[PDB]
Amino acid sequence: VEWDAFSIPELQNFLTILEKEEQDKIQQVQKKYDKFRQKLEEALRES
Amino acid sequence: EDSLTKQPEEVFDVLEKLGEGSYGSVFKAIHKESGQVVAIKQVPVESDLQEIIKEISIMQQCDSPYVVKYYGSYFKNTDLWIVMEYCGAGSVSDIIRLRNKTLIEDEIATILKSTLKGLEYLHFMRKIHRNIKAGNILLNTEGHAKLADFGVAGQLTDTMAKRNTVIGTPFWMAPEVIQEIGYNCVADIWSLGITSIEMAEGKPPYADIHPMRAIFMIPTNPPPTFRKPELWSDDFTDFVKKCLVKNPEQRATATQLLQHPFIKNAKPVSILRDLITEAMEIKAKRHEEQQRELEEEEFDFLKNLSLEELQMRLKALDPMMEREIEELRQRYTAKRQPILDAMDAKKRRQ
């Protein structure tokens, strides 16, 4: 992509989209680690 | 039939994982009752049940020592369990991959001798494999080659999914398949011919070339040979020539290729014993070597885990997150680096 072709507001929309994508994957891994504690812990309760 | 009504885990003790492809994971297992080792594949039902079952119905109606035997099925937790014959040594493609070495003639002849037996068996029943290649020829722990992962009738003109995935890899296709958009028994012989070169050189002719370009070459150019034909015998060389015959009416049948010297003078399956042990041994060395690595630098493993190795992972769980999401923050600073460098310029111009 030749990003030099876009304007400030446009380009800004892209940074926003990449951030919206980042937060949605940083929270996708948190939901992964918080579903893992709830299983390691429930397993400790079986010991 | 009574063992089919029982639940899977209660009939077989599933052991180590063996690998995967594009439709699920393959596993090793042991029949608790007779001790006969079997294989068990696990596919997600949600993803096109019709396509999986069609292959199942084709393999189950096959009964040959040269065709991988299918035993039955079960249903368990959104996963359809397929019990298959256990070919421990993996596929010819995997063995060549594992050892990092091509196959010697004698090795090739033996493998081809049984592969041909399978083709003859199939063709005699007026069936077609439609998809012969090294990756679909499986060797068991003893050295017995078997045909697997069959193609299915009409896999070329079936809309888009399979009317496009086969197109992407046409290196084993016979010329008349490209021009007729269909298959004849002798098509498999051509594929076998290419597979012969695949075993000696490690990859088929035109493999490294763009498909679209191959699709045009195969029916146009003269049949391929060895990149170094002096390293191979005259029996071997000639046999290949007889398979790679562009005219499907002048292409030797499976029944006839069994009469060719290269094959008729083939060694017993015991010569594979040595190349098989190395492959399986390396397969084990990688297994243990890799299991000790994933255990160091760190709904079944938890049931099979100890109390103290379960309590210490939970404690070392957070440290794994600061390194997991700090990498994500570095990846997206890279993705936005251009956009910011561009905005930099535009903020300098106005």
Ligand SMILES: Nc1ncnc2c1ncn2[C@@H]1O[C@H](COP(=O)(O)OP(=O)(O)NP(=O)(O)O)[C@@H](O)[C@H]1O
């Ligand atoms: N019964 C078996 N015993 C031992 N190894 C096996 C057995 N079946 C399959 N394998 C190996 O496991 C690998 C993965 O199997 P699979 O899920 O079918 O992927 P794939 O067959 O290579 N891709 P595809 O041809 O599209 O199905 C195979 O390539 C074999 O090497």
Ligand SMILES: [Mg+2]
């Ligand atoms: Mg397969």
